[model samples]
Target chain A: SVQLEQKLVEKFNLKRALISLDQPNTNEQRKQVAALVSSYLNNNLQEGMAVAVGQGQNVAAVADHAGIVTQRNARFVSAIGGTHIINADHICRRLAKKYGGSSETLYAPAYVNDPSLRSAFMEHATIKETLSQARKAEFALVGIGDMDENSHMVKLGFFTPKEFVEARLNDGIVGDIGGFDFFKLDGTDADTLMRGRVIGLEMEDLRQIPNVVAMASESRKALSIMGALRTGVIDVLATSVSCAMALLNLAEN
Target chain B: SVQLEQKLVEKFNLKRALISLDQPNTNEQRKQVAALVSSYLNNNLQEGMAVAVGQGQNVAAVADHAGIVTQRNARFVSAIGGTHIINADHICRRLAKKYGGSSETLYAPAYVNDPSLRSAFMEHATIKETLSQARKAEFALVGIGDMDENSHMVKLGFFTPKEFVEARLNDGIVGDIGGFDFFKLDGTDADTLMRGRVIGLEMEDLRQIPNVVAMASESRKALSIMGALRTGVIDVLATSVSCAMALLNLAEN
Candidate 1:
């Protein structure tokens, strides 16, 4: 287990790595890795520091398990706008409530039908201010999403089934960071129909953040996590041991 | 206050009335009414009973405040399919978690772009089974949604801005029940563009449920509540005192 963790950090050149015990149940595995993320945040987050939060089940689980041993008047900003169940605004609010901080919401839809609509939303003063805050965040917590049928974006109706298949087959899309920016196996951006249809910070903005913690727990997310690492934007990788091993096997090949 | 409650019960011919003290803050008023709903459910719900749950902020508040003093192996079924925040499936899961019961999800979208798509989803065996269970529910909890700008349905992107205005101007849609089943002030179904776009139990199905508890907290929902009352489906009305008074004023005219 130690060797696997060391290999992952070394191969990816990550600042830190959190590998949780693999569980038979997927939800349990996610919760276990989320606990590790919560502990890390509880220990590392300083007073008045802002953390950009993204939307997904993995990040939502971290917010759910987060607690404050010592209260810090920090700030949690939404890296993306609102969507269905696992929205960034709701997760930010939960994190703020747990950690004794304030939360800021991005008052725009996460996904728009047209790029022009997204551009209009970006020009809105409130959205601009929220994205400004997100870009200046000291830390960011996000999810590495796999391009699968059960992916969060697919289930949320952001991507139609046809679009989902097209992105994988035509665009060579492997995964996404924070449910917004799609990437290929080589970590290059995938030029898909949804490229500019999302209202959130860009990959360049995420790269500017000092510490970006990316989490993925399911075994199916092994390749996605590897792709996300190759993007060179994730500072820390938190995942399950089995997924980590699978990622290592893929790396060797 | 007593007179207002009694008058509302008599005017609407309701089986029960829960009127909470109106507060300056809207959120506090919602929480107060939700507490009343929680107490009623905690007291009345029996073991193995099934409850049909709906989507909206009001119903979500009720689920948030719900508690189980005594464990009951009940069932909470989604009366409608899923959407963005405050979806029926999520609300049912929360209710089950709080009240020691089980939750059933309707595996379909709450609002489809076309009526034919809605029809296709309804024909699915799993969706059919879930709605059948919902139709057989002894009790149902739902929200009375006004056709105003800040309505939950509009905010959820189910109704576009143009469609919202058209519904009010052309179709005379004053409000809705459970975010579906739009109705006019005369208690007739509104022939709007979105009339058949929603996937859920119909008004007739709600009428078959022995006890239908409908909630509305904001003052703007007075006319909507009155229209809902005219539909004669709601057996229990839970709302704020101010809203109830406004409803009485509307009734007088």
Candidate 2:
């Protein structure tokens, strides 16, 4: 559903990036698009600096990105970040654990990742952090996916009745990107429908980031991308032009 | 423990990175050393992504990262990528609704805020997804934590004892920065005895990727960092000079 090269560069401002564009049906167009997207991001993982990856979130493009750098001999360290859903409460418990150092921690948001409200706790916290990181991180390596309520995150536990109501009540289709965060964002209170539509990374923030590279692209994603960039979380994007065009079309307000 | 910049630029044959350090923190003579760090990484995040922010897991640095990004803008669609915990996956069973996409997406190693894992069936599927994503991810943007039987993940129910044990019994402290679908990666057996320690990127399919970065500088992270590289998961490293010096001494073996 996403690309790797660009995601890394844009979010992390990597010096160099090599992607395993060695996929089947390698066509001139595909390579061109991939390269364009990769270059478009324009970031790099430095020589002696490394980004904490796979901390508490899923990291593929970041891995793919790391692969590219490694293929080129770019030295780095990939570690994990973030708190587990179970211990989400600890987000505020140990300020030192999350960051290098922090006397006051903020756990009231999503610190308690308990089975009961862990869902909302994380959703809220991830969003909160997502917004926080967007400004701090030149860029963030991110992931994309379709939302399956019955899927583990929601069905197995995280979701709460109210949260579910919020989702269904609103017209939400997809979810998070690295750090469970995103760059572009928007939201609407469709109280009339009994649901609330929340676009991550409010539109206001999108104008500020130099770029917001999104991974994962497909037909179904028309909605995801439409909503994602609805508030403009993407700028130097990496995706099949098919979806790219779709996104362009979706851009029509 | 490593960095991946020179290699990235060389492989891509490109220009500078967005995230780079302007100058090494020579002040903390014991903590800063970037003989080969990337200028781009040093410029943006790596140089000071989360220098020192939050608490235990979500300390000031943590919140700072989250806060900074949330407040920033993304060029993608001119939208806000960050939001409050209340509007995101924080709501249990909220379907992890976000603007760009679904929160259920891969965060690498497939761990997320989804509480549905509390159920055995759901947990099984999520675990597989986590493994799959971990296998596919090129670079991992993750965090490091020191947990034990009483680790917060356990206490908060993020992972089951059995699952934790599985990751435990099947993990090598210094394994592939990423893991293969199986345990005992990079020719190292999983070690649970070092609950205090951890191995990242257990290279199940080492041939699949070449770059796995592990970033952990704390003193207690000795085992985690050592194990990560030992298992062949980490090739490059970026950490405090203190850590580098200590590892250099340990490498005498």
Candidate 3:
């Protein structure tokens, strides 16, 4: 931890590294986390290196004339000029394909029997199609979900709206990130609660990469990060500083 | 001309910027031109800059799909963001405002005047709508066109087959710009050649663009570039060293 923190400090020429703080609230932590990220980006990123905006699970209004889709995974497509995959976690691996000028963006356009795939595409292939599959890049980022029943990616859109209603009526926190199947914190099925269509990156894929960083600010996500740690999913982890400290205290307790 | 060539050479830092050569019996020019483009890219472009591709009076057989469209005017919704207005030489100006993206893809469930538009869109937008407008860049670059008469854009489900037949067999090359309209080149009752719908972008819109760079090197296009220029549009252009030289010679002759 000392060496890791030291490298970041050296790169950013940061005057101070992480210090033990008395406040463990989400707002305070969010401020600290954003500061660290801004400094780290300035230190390591080049002028035009494409950024994958995975700040967190943003519930974008994915509506068509069919009305608004209240919650679908929101990954940044307009910010960068590159390809992105929005299927299961495994498919998300394609996001890392980079080249000295030649990495590829490959997708399993059709789900090879993955039940979690809601729509084959997330209505934003305009960027991906423009990029050659052989083009490569240097950075990758993704959002992390707290392991509970409330996450939008669990059922992958195949589940009915009644399923979500029933699950939430029972009181659940979030969904698990592996196999992208949702479950209550105590390990209960979430299918009965999530409604309509489920669209997003899979949990298993998020947990597999090395360079991929997790930007989770949800106050309740202490336990989920713990699970992610077990899977070696994140090489670098960022959380609301309070969430970080809370998880640290939770482990001790 | 010599001074202009010298300036272009200096701008690109080329030793032989305006070399003169005859159009070879075959498309040896294609590889040379592609290499020239590749050289320009490697020299000037960095990662993540928006690069543009224009077919220029050529059939755009985008994707692995072989639907050779003449004057395809489709709105490409980028996966990474920003909309791509394919084929508009003004680049981003003069969009058909009959639709929008305020909700749902604004254009996918869009309203056109009638069935003719639907069919023309079916020829291109059918695939574009279902696939969300994904395009795969092909390596074996080739450009070819016929002195086309009618257009799928004009009669694409908007007009009846009889109308489409009348426009094609009877009306003929009246719907130019690689054959995309079912009306006369002018929006006015021009020579009354077309009998069907005017699908895709309006011809006047396509014509009004200041820079429609058409690359020609073969005898097949001896009159095509000149013909498009006669339409009283086109701002900037690019072509083979030989074809440019030939135009110079033809002017002198």
Candidate 4:
């Protein structure tokens, strides 16, 4: 077992961190990561508790590796938008099937034209229920994000080139926890501008969850991981060794 | 195929009506009726079209008898709230599984404390998507309702006895389609007071659906059936012979 450097764990105040010597690039590695997360969930989850997952390949990998849910009354739910890409909804369905439980998805566009439209979409019965369930989730698995030009959010059409630049300037943004709610490295409210307009779980809602786990891989994501952890929303993190090293270095410098 | 009374069908300008010789009292009989509705849907559903179901025992019965859905891409969704009864959500999931499709549900309480929460819930992503899909559905299976003391709406806790009485007095409401959105017997709108506060499809939303079908099975529901039909929200009707005859008598009187 690869333990995170002692200094690194204390700096971020992470409850726990697990490292895979190899990166989660291939299916086998992803499955291993999924097993780790699944094991953690199996240990921590109590009766009638649920887990919420955000979108991305790494989280999807964890879902895929998650063995037979064997846990009775397990619930898996999606936390955010970008149904256009179809990853979040797809992952939740597959995860639920593994657990012999049901999956509920937020079936609206991740982003809408205005806050009012977003509110209208939020009031929808299916979406509202999924989020309500998400709030009560005992465990949350999310993908940490970096707000670089080549960020996943941009690729998902959540932000345009100009919009990204504007957010960076106005908020001094660093990275995000989950696929939504991007924030600064200092944990300030860089997300205020996008509030209510974006669907899925809010940062405040995420912070209140008892066990929030974030999984990210690759050294390139080090800076984003740093920013995400700084927000103090994530209780645990699972990542590659190199990425952990990168985060450690980023913090030091 | 027992036919509806010719005068009754013509008066309501209904496309067609089917009369079950026996009332749906037992599981077997309910299953038989379910078979009929399922068969109708299988024959009538078009490419890329979906089916929306309102909450009730009759709709639940139809979902059970839906048989192996040979039709691919069959999307079953809920048209209203009240997941607490665990019927509508259960039916959608089971039906979707039978047809190798998927079920989506509206996740809020059937009713809320204020209109604002209703609007906020409406802004949820999954609920918004299901509702949009529901509006585009070619076939809609709904339960017709009477505002009398023994109505299912009261049992389902959608209204208190006091609230029901208030709605009747204020809106001149007589009956309802789909257990929500009560309307007058003369086909005028009696839903103005509670408009925007209820989660799920409204009367106008149901009216726009192309194949809105109402399913009822008791003589006690005859008056409610007439009012539901008079609103022009339902294009097709399915009921017991006694209920159909009583509806005709009520209309004539």
Query: Which candidate has the top score in TM-score?
Result: 4
Q: Against the true structure, what is each candidate's TM-score? A: 0.57, 0.32, 0.39, 0.77
Score candidate 3 by lDDT. Answer: 0.34
DockQ of each: 0.04, 0.07, 0.06, 0.12
Candidate 2 residue lDDT tens string, A1-253 = 2344444334434332233332444233334434443343323432332222211211232222211222121211111122223221122112122222211112222112243333342344433453354444343333343343113344444446566445444544344443233222242212221111211233344345453445544545556545454444444445564655455455443
Cα lDDT tens digits, model 3, B203-233, are: 4543433323233445445444444434543
Instruction: Using lDDT, give the best candidate's number.
Output: 1
Error of 4 at A125 (Å): 12
Lowest-sum lDDT 10-residue window in model 3 chain B: B95-104
Q: Residue B185: error of model 1 in Å?
A: 3.8
Residue A142, model 4: lDDT of 86
What tens digits encode model 1's per-residue C-alpha lDDT throughout B51-135? 9998888899988883445678899988887653577877886787688888766655576555765665566444677789999
Cα TM-score of candidate 3: 0.39
The model with the greater lDDT, 2 or 3, is 3
Off-target runs (Cα >4 Å) in candidate 1 are A1-15, A18-35, A46-182, A192-205, A208-210, A216-226, A239-253, B1-36, B46-138, B142-182, B192-205, B208-210, B216-225, B239-253
RMSD (Cα, Å) for all candidates, in order, is: 7.9, 19.1, 14.8, 4.9
TM-score of chain B of each: 0.93, 0.42, 0.41, 0.85
Model 1 chain A worst lDDT run, 10 consecutive residues = A149-158
